Amino acid sequence: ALPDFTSDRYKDAYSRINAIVIEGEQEAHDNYIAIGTLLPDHVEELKRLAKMEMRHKKGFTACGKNLGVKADMDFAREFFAPLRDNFQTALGQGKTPTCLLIQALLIEAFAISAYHTYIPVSDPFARKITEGVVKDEYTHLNYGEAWLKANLESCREELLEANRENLPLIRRMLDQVAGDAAVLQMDKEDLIEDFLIAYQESLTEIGFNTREITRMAAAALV
């Protein structure tokens, strides 16, 4: 059953979830612009992807305002810090495959799962905004898949390392958000299932085989 969007219980949980989504979208904008420094010939396309993320950020900010919720931005900045630090380390080292696995694969799959899971339990205003964001996230996943597919033979080992290092951070993020997501009437098992399907499908598209993907998804056990 649909949550009571007006309750103090719902608004409290929404203040943290809404802040996480707003921060995630800002970091996604910043990440695609940063990847433009590593792929100078991709700048115009990366600018278009980054502009989409800012449109998403604005839409999710309006979701919070619509419910009379003040987003807990400090909570959201801490939530992304471990993954943000790994993206910044990779960026500084010029490690384009790791930057793309973090943003274009892991984060886009986590957003797709979160948005798909939220849609059926969302208020009417946020439902339309969320439905209107999901198609773009598939475009972002496709962009990352395409580059990694084209460059797989040169970056195989780096991707296995990036997955080993960062997939457990996504799992920790899922563990951390689960309580508030349950107040929002979202089941953690649906979040995990949708995320693993999106991520496993992206890896298949890139060119990893069933054994490789199984070994990769098992990195979440750390």
Ligand SMILES: CCCCCCCCCCCCCCCCCC(=O)O
């Ligand atoms: C505010 C309404 C949206 C709420 C959706 C449910 C969110 C629950 C889990 C939060 C996951 C954060 C995903 C990070 C966003 C990544 C953005 C992107 O790369 O485009």
Ligand SMILES: [Fe+3]
């Ligand atoms: Fe987005």
Ligand SMILES: [Fe+3]
């Ligand atoms: Fe995105």
